[PDB]
Curated annotation (Swiss-Prot), chain A:
Catalytic activity: (E)-4-coumaroyl-CoA + 3 malonyl-CoA + 3 H(+) = 2',4,4',6'-tetrahydroxychalcone + 3 CO2 + 4 CoA
Cited PROSITE patterns: CHALCONE_SYNTH
Function: The primary product of this enzyme is 4,2',4',6'-tetrahydroxychalcone (also termed naringenin-chalcone or chalcone) which can under specific conditions spontaneously isomerize into naringenin.
Organism: Medicago sativa (Alfalfa)
Effect in UniProt of substituting G247A: Decreases catalytic efficiency 2-fold
Pfam families per the UniProt record, alphabetical: Chal_sti_synt_C, Chal_sti_synt_N
Effect of N327 to A/D/H/K/Q: Drastically reduces catalytic efficiency
Name of the protein in its database record: Chalcone synthase 2
Keywords assigned: Acyltransferase, Flavonoid biosynthesis, Transferase
GO biological process, one term: chalcone biosynthetic process
Result when mutating H294 to A/D/N/T: Drastically reduces catalytic efficiency
Pathway in which the depicted protein is active: Secondary metabolite biosynthesis; flavonoid biosynthesis
Length: 380, 388
């Protein structure tokens, strides 16, 4: 009587962001000023076009004007600054993650002493113990909670944590898994450089945020309220994409090397992933399922939409999150699930999935990995 | 189709079982008896006569005969900051790990797959563990590339967990294999001291003890539920798992990844904390089985240090033979972090076969595996042996 009976189900969702709201319209002037680069006028025009095409209205950042003034080495492009950044991360990642987790637990409505497993995900973690240990302490969870830390996986990790939570919940009766994704740009922020150009795109897209979930099989009637059910999962590496998205954790912090073929590679490989997931269910109409896609950038969304001839409405929840929060790495897809279920309830639809039955969630990231998670909605 | 019908046809049936084990170590073998002279010379610290005496004592009582290290005198001579106690050297260490962790891990994996005997294309999941990883993609990606596994292998990287992670990967493999029909999980723990090696300091004796104990190595396993009779060959079966944090131990073992690489800091007495919390971990795991005599089960314990083994043995009044397998690995390889407990499982099963015992667990039926590490974490895995 140790294994569970039904499908792993999402029972709650909560999110959080740093208090500092940064409007995109005025970021270019701010960015080039704080990094003492107002004189490279031309390079500011390149960044100007990147922000105008980003389709982002605002982002939230732990890094404030004061903190940047406190750390000149972080404002240069490549200066020794890892130690300073690790200190910021050791405090903020767990704090922001706790804020989101508290809201998820409140929605769930059960004692925190009932949480049996914990999965914590962040692009990087500064020490040993990892962030999972820190969050266990800050939330006051059972000392014997089973922990798993997911670090340096990157932008596709929203799918990864769902994939892990599914097996932990389904193979253990009574198991209730707290999942937390917390991302903070203190590890990636740096000054502009007309040489390292691709590093510039991250400064125009990346933002801060955290999202938490409670996942479990065999929901208790009325006491717990299902939102979405997980059905099948997969992970794969796109062919001829090595180096498409690289990252290096060094003494100058974390630097990225993402080329311009990214949008092309993702969209060209999206069809195979969909067939692998839905052909077994006899589903061929991709406008008949609800969508959740990691908004790595606007181009990825435009080409997937064009490639499959999706109605513009399919990418709505995804584009709404990109517009109001920017690219929060692993946390994005979880924010999108929240936006979709809230919007559906708001407009009086019949299911948490915009009134539809089946859906799909995609994570995209380093090693040009594509994570796929098939979902099913819940009535009303 | 309904989700219910899908779930029913998706799950596996029996308990996760270890089907093969393989290990590997760097080619450079370092004798312990003469390490003090070697270490103080390469770090240009021969004028620290008193400090060297202390280190000689540490090495003499470590119960380690030798270790294998990727770091050689030639490499050390090319990286001057790596020889200092705390100088800017992370970038150089990252380049070393980027190559060695995946290379050493692949060597062990090839041996495990050979024993298993089945196509590499049938591996559905991959778990790679290492104290740290230098880039994005993580080491799990590189191993997949080096081995040529199917691109759709489901991967999970376990980084910055530490010395207790040997238990962590078994705990994860248990759920991945048991909840997915046909799943075959390749598990790899690869540890390289290039990330922790540093010069001696008379104000950081805890860092120095680490220089006397840590060694390099990798271990690989194939784990799966529902073994094909007479084709696949079960070695050990997993029964139950647990993880806990010892009370009042925050600070006992901590590491920091910084510009000077990875450093460790201790607080209190680790051996005492482990030995005082071990009985409760055992009672909770074996009470349900009706076992109170710990000399009646086979043992696998993370050899963090010789003192932990001595105190555990004394606390439970174990016969000398109980720790044979554990002490053999500590003696022949040193503390290889997460990989240790996996080397011990291999030693125990090989010796049981060699000396004619009736089960892979020294002729006994039940056994236990313990992992100890940062945030004073204790991982417990209950095991059942296999006949002959």
């Amino acid at each position: 009587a140790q294994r569970a009976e039904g499908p792993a189900t999402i029972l709650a969702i909560g999110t959080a962001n740093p208090a500092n709201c940064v409007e995109q319209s005025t970021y270019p002037d701010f960015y080039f000023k704080i990094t003492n680069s107002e004189h490279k006028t031309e390079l500011k025009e390149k960044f100007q076009r990147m922000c105008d095409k980003s389709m982002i209205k605002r982002r939230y950042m732990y890094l404030t004007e004061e903190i940047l003034k406190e750390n000149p080495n972080v404002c240069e492009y490549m200066a020794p600054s890892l130690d300073a950044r690790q200190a910021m991360l050791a405090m903020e990642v767990p704090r922001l993650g706790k804020e989101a987790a508290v809201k998820a637990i409140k929605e769930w409505g059960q004692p925190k002493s009932k949480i049996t497993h914990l999965i914590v995900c962040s692009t990087t973690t500064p020490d040993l113990p990892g962030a999972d240990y820190q969050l266990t302490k800050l939330l006051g969870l059972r000392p014997y909670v089973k922990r798993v830390g997911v670090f340096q996986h990157g932008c596709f990790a929203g799918g990864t944590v769902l994939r892990l939570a599914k097996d932990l919940a389904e193979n253990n009766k009574g198991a209730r898994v707290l999942v937390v994704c917390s991302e903070v740009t203190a590890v990636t922020f740096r000054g502009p450089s007309d040489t390292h150009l691709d590093s510039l795109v991250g400064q125009a897209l990346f933002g801060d945020g955290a999202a938490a979930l409670i996942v479990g099989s065999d929901p208790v009637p009325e006491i717990e309220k299902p939102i979405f059910e997980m059905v099948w999962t997969a992970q794969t590496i796109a062919p001829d994409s090595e180096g498409a998205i690289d990252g290096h954790l060094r003494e100058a912090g974390l630097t990225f090397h993402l080329k311009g073929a990214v949008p092309d590679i993702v969209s060209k490989n999206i069809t195979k992933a969909l067939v692998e997931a839905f052909e077994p269910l006899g589903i061929s109409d991709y406008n008949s399922i609800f969508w959740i896609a990691h908004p790595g950038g606007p181009a990825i969304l435009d080409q997937v939409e064009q490639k499959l001839a999706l109605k513009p409405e399919k990418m709505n929840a995804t584009r709404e999150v990109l517009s109001e929060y920017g690219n929060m790495s692993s946390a994005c897809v979880l924010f999108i699930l929240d936006e979709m279920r809230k919007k559906s309830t708001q407009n009086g639809l019949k299911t948490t999935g915009e009134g539809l039955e089946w859906g799909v969630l995609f994570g995209f990231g380093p090693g040009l990995t594509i994570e796929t998670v098939v979902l099913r909605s819940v009535a009303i």
